[PDB]
Amino acid sequence: MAMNGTITTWFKDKGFGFIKDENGDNRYFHVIKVANPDLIKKDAAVTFEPTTNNKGLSAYAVKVVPLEHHHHHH
Incomplete structure (x- = not known):
């Protein structure tokens, strides 16, 4: 299982997409x-x-595949 996909439709404000x-x-x-x-x-x-x-x-x-690893935390 597990396929690789590309993010095409996405609403980050709400938190859903395709x-x-x-x-x-x-x-x-x-x-x-x-x-x-x-x-x-x-x-x-x-x-x-x-x-x-x-x-x-x-x-x-x-799980997203980021090309870099930067910290994002308050």
Whole structure:
């Protein structure tokens, strides 16, 4: 399992969107299921586990692949 996808639709203010991998299609994502949600940016690559949703397809255990590691904490 676990596919690599690109972040295409994303509303960071609210915390939801749609990420499309190269194997399947767009899945319904939500900030709650992301371990590193502040790293979620457009055109960035993420990896997630496949699952199903009421409104379509969805993913769990979403981790973004950042090209750098900078601290973000008050």
